[PDB]
Amino acid sequence: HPDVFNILLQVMDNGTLTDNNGRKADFRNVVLVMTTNAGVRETERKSIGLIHQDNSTDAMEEIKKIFTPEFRNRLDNIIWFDHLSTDVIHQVVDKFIVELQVQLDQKGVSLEVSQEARNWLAEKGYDRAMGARPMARVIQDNLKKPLANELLFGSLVDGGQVTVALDKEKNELTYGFQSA
Amino acid sequence: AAVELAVKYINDRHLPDKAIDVIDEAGARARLMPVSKRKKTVNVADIESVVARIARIPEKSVSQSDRDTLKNLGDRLKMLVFGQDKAIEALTEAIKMARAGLGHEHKPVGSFLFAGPTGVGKTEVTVQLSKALGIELLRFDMSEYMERHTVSRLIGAPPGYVGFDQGGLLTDAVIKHPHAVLLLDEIEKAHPDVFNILLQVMDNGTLTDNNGRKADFRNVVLVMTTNAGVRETERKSIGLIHQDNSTDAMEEIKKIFTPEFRNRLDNIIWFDHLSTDVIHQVVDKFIVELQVQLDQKGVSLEVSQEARNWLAEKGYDRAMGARPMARVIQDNLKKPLANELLFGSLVDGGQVTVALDKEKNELTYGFQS
Amino acid sequence: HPDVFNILLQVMDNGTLTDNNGRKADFRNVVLVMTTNAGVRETERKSIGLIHQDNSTDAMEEIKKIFTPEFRNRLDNIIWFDHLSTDVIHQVVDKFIVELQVQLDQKGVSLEVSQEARNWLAEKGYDRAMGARPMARVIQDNLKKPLANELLFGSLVDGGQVTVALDKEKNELTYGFQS
Amino acid sequence: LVPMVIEQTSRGERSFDIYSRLLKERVIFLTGQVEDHMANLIVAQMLFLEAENPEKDIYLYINSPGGVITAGMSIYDTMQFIKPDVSTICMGQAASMGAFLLTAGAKGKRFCLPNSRVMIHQPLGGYQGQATDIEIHAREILKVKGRMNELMALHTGQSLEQIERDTERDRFLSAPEAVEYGLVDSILTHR
Amino acid sequence: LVPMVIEQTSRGERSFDIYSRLLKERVIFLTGQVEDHMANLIVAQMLFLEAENPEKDIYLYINSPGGVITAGMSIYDTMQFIKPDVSTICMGQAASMGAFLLTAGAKGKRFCLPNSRVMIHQPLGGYQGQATDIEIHAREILKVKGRMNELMALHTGQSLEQIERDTERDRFLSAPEAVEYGLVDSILTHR
Amino acid sequence: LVPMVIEQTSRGERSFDIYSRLLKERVIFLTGQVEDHMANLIVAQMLFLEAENPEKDIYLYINSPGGVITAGMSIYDTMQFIKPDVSTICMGQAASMGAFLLTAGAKGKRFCLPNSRVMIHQPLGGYQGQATDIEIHAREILKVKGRMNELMALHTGQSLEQIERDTERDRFLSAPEAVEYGLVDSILTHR
Ligand SMILES: Nc1ncnc2c1ncn2[C@@H]1O[C@H](COP(=O)(O)OP(=O)(O)O)[C@@H](O)[C@H]1O
């Protein structure tokens, strides 16, 4: 509700918010970070024109409409996050893979993914509009699914090393369960 | 394990107390459970079982006891629901990953938007999944939550409800049953403000009530059913050349659901119209239910393969899926049996047989008690 | 309103309705019947053209667009009430007149309405647009009202033995007064 | 000025012009000299009705004194292409192009009022310029004349030789005479 | 006049124009002499359709006797620029500019009705002025003629010399002849 | 007729004409002979867009044969006055005062389609009356000519002498040639 914005005017301009009882809280050491998806539809949609338009500015105008000027002036700065480029996506895939390894370590299985396989995952799941969340889903559908069946139904009940490779001819991933 | 597991699965309790609770219960359970053949030591498996009971969630020992149940989960759901295998695989694989330890740390077991035509099994696979797993089914009909003010009931109570029982229906339901299937039928009908409530459920795995109780959704399967794109697909073009209206369904889905909500979804399954081959399986299923109903009254029914095919042709409608099969089953079989069941040979003895003649093109019912 | 149909979907599909209050209403024994006049308008009206187009399937088309497929799928069957033919119309007047005769029987009055009078009563009583709803007044006004007025205060105070016959010139019903 | 008409609906009253109201009943109107813009409208109306109910039959009321043949071909081709049978009813008069569309109606659904007239004749297009250009344009109209006669003969059922002799000059046919010639199956009467 | 039409949407009943209703289905109509205003309108329609669904292909019904070349070239560029394949159908007749847009359709999606006609001729333009101005003005006519022939040859696939010989004078090509020439892929029959 | 397009929004359905819908997307169409009334309409559109989003970029599809020089300066003044970068695209022909507005777009955002043609020439105007008035009017027509050459030189980057020499006689520049001249940054040539 817009009332919440009015509640934060003293939080950012004076640092103190008072309860109905009358006690005052101190916000001088609390890092305040807000997140908003305003103008997400504007970015997702495409302009009706020969030349595509960057709708990053449309989000800012929406921010002005939603938030009152007093609220926005108090803010230190309005950071506009940018879409994930293909280069950082490779780093993003590495992050999910290590998260998978931590889950796998408890089970006793070690996962090894070739560099070519990692690139293949990025191309299949890359979606600038959808960000990094599709990358998790492609990894989940491709890597976590085979491992899950094997861990439960065989070849991985007991901890064993795993290796992943890409077949260029078939353009499909391969796996070596190698139990124990 | 007691400390690490308590943090993960035991909420609203602080760490030095949670672990002591797990540790104390493990000692109590092992000491008095086996009268003879008692293990003096407390292994890690005992701790996992204790947390499971406290949190009402399965443990991590699925690789031995329940390995058979998960392996046959997809096969059993195929017998109950024909076609739509992509939905069954999505649900069973999502479950397997969670039990195997690959599930998301802070997200539900699964979040799937099942969109398709009527009578295609959108709300049937969810009801059968819970029965297969033997877990409580949380069914919420969004037709009630059309307005903004009704949404507050999910996370609380109406403004100034001094009366007790002011706990959110969704928050209290999930707390009572941490392991359950959450079905939000006709999610499109719900006010857009309901999608904002699910953002923390799908992405953070928890929803907080106005009072402040935290509901855990990390172990609940979230399934939503919508008929958003059926109208667009069924729409017929007006032009010399017919148009391939294949992607129109997704475009309608994109408009009704904001990108943030759709991104959180684990997978969007598009159910498809039942094929003629699938209808034969459906006829057999309905007949099986009829046999069970007759078994209560002591009547036995056997139908010929030829009669089954005739029933399929009469009831095969692409737009209406499998629901019309019930109507022909009702008109053709239940009507004669009902009259005889009340008064006639079917009072007792059963031994019913059904057949048809190709020339007549009409079913024949014979009763010999 | 469309929102009402959404409420019935769970009723027919699940058989149980939950009120906002919180109580669970389980009504699986109640039969559900709805009455609509959507198709009659299309079928009764003729096509706007020199050629009369076929309206046999027009009635179903309206119901398909007016009612969502999901709503129609849950319904057991859709039954059409057809216009009352002359043969069945005779039975309707027979029921109304016989009903009045039963009421008069306790009082002791008797009627001898002719079969020809039945035909004339049917045309005025039954209308294609309003059906048999106007037929209520025709039987009561044409038969009960003239005789009832005479019964309370008339040439014949009591004894009945009344008879009725169609009058071609006046299009009125004869009243017999035998004490 | 087009008068509006109210059509009762379950939701409420709906206001539509007289032409649009009849279009809902599949009653299209062809009027005036044929042109690229009226034909585009007529074909557009046919395509709209096809998707609604392809089984149902469209009805085209032809009251035109003739027009450009090229524009009419779009109407003719559209009628044949669509699954729905097009019923052509000649109101008042059907000239060379109007008669072509009239006879092009589906068999059994073509009708003429008892007092209408039907005139058929060869195209009267002309061109001027260099001798070489005139030859190409002159040659083309003979090709078009062949197509008009061959498609007219197919629908009417008369031989190509019969059509060309009659179409040498303007020939006005009455409604009964049209039935004998084969342009229409019957004369529209109130059953 | 334009007959309004009813469309049943998920939201409820909606009233659209005859052309507007067809625009929702990606059907764009090109009719009459090409001009800047109508060309600009077609351009606007194509851009709107691309935004709604770029995957879905656009349909264009061309029934035109030819017009300004500059206006038409804007349409051609837009058709090639946008990702959707702009299917082209020849209703009734297509002139040199009309046929240039017809052949510009994507491969496998260009059609011509059976009784449709086509015409292709060199661009005809006349300028009056000083000899110096005529030289500069004349050069543009040669350049555009070559560009049109080159583009026409590219879509049809025929030799440039053959296109130059045929384009020197007006040439009329029937529907079956257009398919062989390469202007259209195939005739539309019972789709 | 102008088609009506439905814009789907979360709040509800909205109906807009094809041109107005494009204006909502910061697309302006400068089509037809330049005039005071049409130029005023374009000026109003730019100001409305500037207020809605000054930081965002405006677009101006120029398909016009040129026109009134003074009316066009109102657009040029407004293009440079408003903070938004008024990108320009050229569809079909661009002529005197059409190209002047096409070359006045922000650097790096001007574009021309592959087949678009650009024409540039000096102002053409005449006055009839007393010799004294002709001298005054003649001086006015010369001063305006120099100002356009100065402005054209600024955007293109060529010296004033180069522009004056070329602009003395009508000069037609192809789309790639315009890039060499500097009227536009580059050709789109994108899918
Ligand atoms: N594939 C199927 N196999 C068996 N029963 C089915 C199937 N599809 C639908 N049904 C039956 O139809 C009903 C489910 O319809 P549902 O898919 O929930 O409809 P909707 O999509 O309109 O919500 C139940 O009665 C169920 O038994």
CB D33 within 8 Å of CB D64? yes
CA distances from E165 to A93, C135, E155 (A): 61, 86, 17
Closest protein CA for atom 13 of ligand 1:
B119
H or E segment and range at residue A147: helix A145-153
Question: Treating both helix axes as pointing N-terminal to C-terminal, what angle do B44-55 and B2-9 enclose, rounded to 10 degrees?
Answer: 20
Residue B124 Cα to ligand 1 middle (Å) = 5
Position in ligand 1 atom list of the atom nearest CA B123: 18
Question: Treating both helix axes as pointing N-terminal to C-terminal, what angle do D131-156 and D69-81 enclose, rounded to 10 degrees?
Answer: 40
Work out the widest C-alpha separation in chain D, in whole angstroms: 67
What distance in Å separates the CA atoms of residue F19 and residue A2, rounded to the nearest whole number? 35
Would the CA dihedral through C66, C68, C69, C74 be positive or negative? Answer: negative
What distance in Å separates the CA atoms of residue A45 and residue D4, rounded to the nearest whole number? 40
Q: Which positions ≥6 away from F168 have C-beta within 8 Å?
A: F122
What distance in Å separates the CA atoms of residue B364 and residue B354, rounded to the nearest whole number? 6
The label of the residue with tokens 């009469």 reads B314
Query: Under DSSP, is residue A32 helix (H, G, I), strand (E, B) or coil?
Result: coil
Q: What part of E 106-125 touches B (C-beta under 8 Å)?
A: 111
Rg (CA), chain F: 18
Beta strand extents in B95-186 (DSSP E only): 110-115, 137-141, 181-185
The tokens for D137 are 């344009």
What distance in Å separates the CA atoms of residue E18 and residue D55, rounded to the nearest whole number? 21
The label of the residue with tokens 């109201």 reads D21
For the residues of chain E, what is the DSSP string, one character each? ----EEEE-SS-EEEE-HHHHHHHTTEEEEESS--HHHHHHHHHHHHHHHHH-SSSPEEEEEEE----HHHHHHHHHHHHHSSS-EEEEEEEEE-HHHHHHHHTSPTT-EEE-TT-EEEE--------S-HHHHHHHHHHHHHHHHHHHHHHHHHH---HHHHHHHHTS-EEEEHHHHHHHTS-SEE----
Distance from CA of C153 to the nearest CA of D (A): 49
The tokens for E137 are 């003005």
- List, by residue number, the catalytic residues of D: 96, 121
Count up the domains in chain D and report the number: 1
Using what technique was this structure determined?
A: cryo-EM
What distance in Å separates the CA atoms of residue B265 and residue F2, rounded to the nearest whole number? 41
The tokens for B354 are 């059904």
What distance in Å separates the CA atoms of residue A125 and residue A130, rounded to the nearest whole number? 10
The tokens for E119 are 């015409």
φ, ψ dihedrals at F5, nearest 5°: -120, 140
Residue B318 DSSP symbol: T
Alpha-carbon torsion angle D99, D101, D107, D108, nearest 10: -60
**Terminal C-alpha separation, chain F:** 30
In short, whether B281's Cβ falls inside 6 Å of ligand 1 is no
Q: Choosing from F64, F96, F116, F155, which is the catalytic residue?
A: F96
Position in ligand 1 atom list of the atom nearest CA B285: 4
The label of the residue with tokens 């094997």 reads A150
| Alpha helix segments (H runs only) across D14-93 | 18-24, 36-52, 69-81
The label of the residue with tokens 């949407």 reads E9
Work out the widest C-alpha separation in chain C, in whole angstroms: 69
Closest protein CA for atom 20 of ligand 1:
B118
Q: Which positions ≥6 away from D188 have C-beta within 8 Å?
A: C50, D89, D111, D112, D113, D114
Residue A49: list chain E partners with CB under 8 A: 47
What distance in Å separates the CA atoms of residue F58 and residue B341, rounded to the nearest whole number? 79
For the residues of E129-141, what is the DSSP string, one character each? S-HHHHHHHHHHH
Query: A118 — contact with chain B (CB < 8 Å)?
Result: no
Does B260 sit within 8 Å of A40, measured CB to CB?
Answer: yes
What distance in Å separates the CA atoms of residue B226 and residue B114, rounded to the nearest whole number? 7
* Chain center to CA of D153: 15
What distance in Å separates the CA atoms of residue B359 and residue B340, rounded to the nearest whole number? 26
The tokens for C30 are 């109640």
Residue D4's beta-bridge partner residues?
Answer: D17
Side chain identity at B2, as an amino acid letter? A
* Chain center to CA of B163: 34
Query: Under DSSP, is residue F169 helix (H, G, I), strand (E, B) or coil?
Result: coil
Residue F53: list chain A partners with CB under 8 A: 57-58, 61
Residue D186: list chain C partners with CB under 8 A: none
Residue D144 DSSP symbol: H
The tokens for F10 are 């979360």
Does D16 sit within 8 Å of E31, measured CB to CB?
Answer: no
Side chain identity at B131, as an amino acid letter? K
In short, whether B114's Cβ falls inside 6 Å of ligand 1 is no
CA distances from B62 to A69, A151, B66, F19 (A): 56, 10, 5, 63
Position in ligand 1 atom list of the atom nearest CA B84: 1
Does E61 sit within 8 Å of D70, measured CB to CB?
Answer: no
Closest CA to B317 of B328, B306, B307: B328
Query: Under DSSP, is residue D182 helix (H, G, I), strand (E, B) or coil?
Result: coil
Chains B and D touch, using 3 or more CB pairs below 8 Å: yes
**Terminal C-alpha separation, chain C:** 60
Q: Count H helices, E strands: chain D?
A: 7, 10
Across E118-139, b (16+ Cβ under 10 Å) vs e yields: bbbbbeeeeeeeeeeeeebbee
SS (H, E, C) chain C: CHHHHHHHHHHHHHCEEECCCCCEEECCCCCCCCCCCHHHHHHHCCCCCCCCCCCCCHHHHHHHHHCCHHHHHHCCCCCCCCCCCHHHHHHHHHHHHHHHHHHHHHHCCCCCECHHHHHHHHHHHCECCCECCCHHHHHHHHHHHHHHHHHHCCCCCCCCCCCECECCCCCCECCCCCC
Q: Choosing from F20, F121, F137, F174, which is the catalytic residue?
A: F121
Alpha-carbon torsion angle F105, F111, F116, F117, nearest 10: 40
What distance in Å separates the CA atoms of residue E97 and residue D65, rounded to the nearest whole number? 30
Distance from CA of C53 to the nearest CA of D (A): 8
Q: Which positions ≥6 away from A53 have C-beta within 8 Å?
A: A47, F25, F26, F56, F57
H or E segment and range at residue B324: helix B323-329
The residue whose CB lies within 8 Å of the most ligand 1 atoms, and thus the one to mutate among B120, B131, B185, B282, is B120
The residue whose CB lies within 8 Å of the most ligand 1 atoms, and thus the one to mutate among C9, C10, C13, C68, is C13
Pairing, β F117-120 against β F86-94: parallel
Query: C76 — contact with chain B (CB < 8 Å)?
Result: yes
In short, whether B98's Cβ falls inside 6 Å of ligand 1 is no
What distance in Å separates the CA atoms of residue A117 and residue A124, rounded to the nearest whole number? 11
What distance in Å separates the CA atoms of residue B301 and residue B315, rounded to the nearest whole number? 21
The tokens for F72 are 């066009």
CA distances from B89 to B220, B222, F26 (A): 17, 15, 46
What distance in Å separates the CA atoms of residue F129 and residue D181, rounded to the nearest whole number? 73
**Terminal C-alpha separation, chain B:** 65
What distance in Å separates the CA atoms of residue D88 and residue D98, rounded to the nearest whole number? 10
The tokens for C143 are 């038969």
Does A50 sit within 8 Å of F25, measured CB to CB?
Answer: no
Q: How many residues does chain A have?
A: 180
For the residues of B219-237, what is the DSSP string, one character each? T-EEEEEE-TTHHHHH---
> Is F64 known to be catalytic?
no
Q: Count H helices, E strands: chain B?
A: 17, 10
For the residues of A39-92, what is the DSSP string, one character each? THHHHHS--SSSS---THHHHHHHHHHHS-HHHHHHSS------PPPHHHHHHH
The chain B residues in contact with chain D (CB within 8 A) are 236-240
Discontinuities in chain F (C→N > 2.5 Å), after residue? none
What distance in Å separates the CA atoms of residue E105 and residue E156, rounded to the nearest whole number? 11
H or E segment and range at residue B327: helix B323-329
| Resolution of the experimental model, in Å, one decimal | 3.2
Residue E47: list chain F partners with CB under 8 A: 22, 27
- List, by residue number, the catalytic residues of E: 96, 121
What distance in Å separates the CA atoms of residue E115 and residue D73, rounded to the nearest whole number? 6
Beta strand extents in B116-166 (DSSP E only): 137-141
* Chain center to CA of F26: 15
Range of the domain at F55: 1-191
The tokens for B315 are 């009831």
Alpha-carbon torsion angle E129, E132, E133, E137, nearest 10: 120
Residue F89's beta-bridge partner residues?
Answer: F61, F111
Burial class (CB in 10 A: 0-12, 13-18, 19+), D135: exposed
What distance in Å separates the CA atoms of residue B259 and residue B244, rounded to the nearest whole number? 25
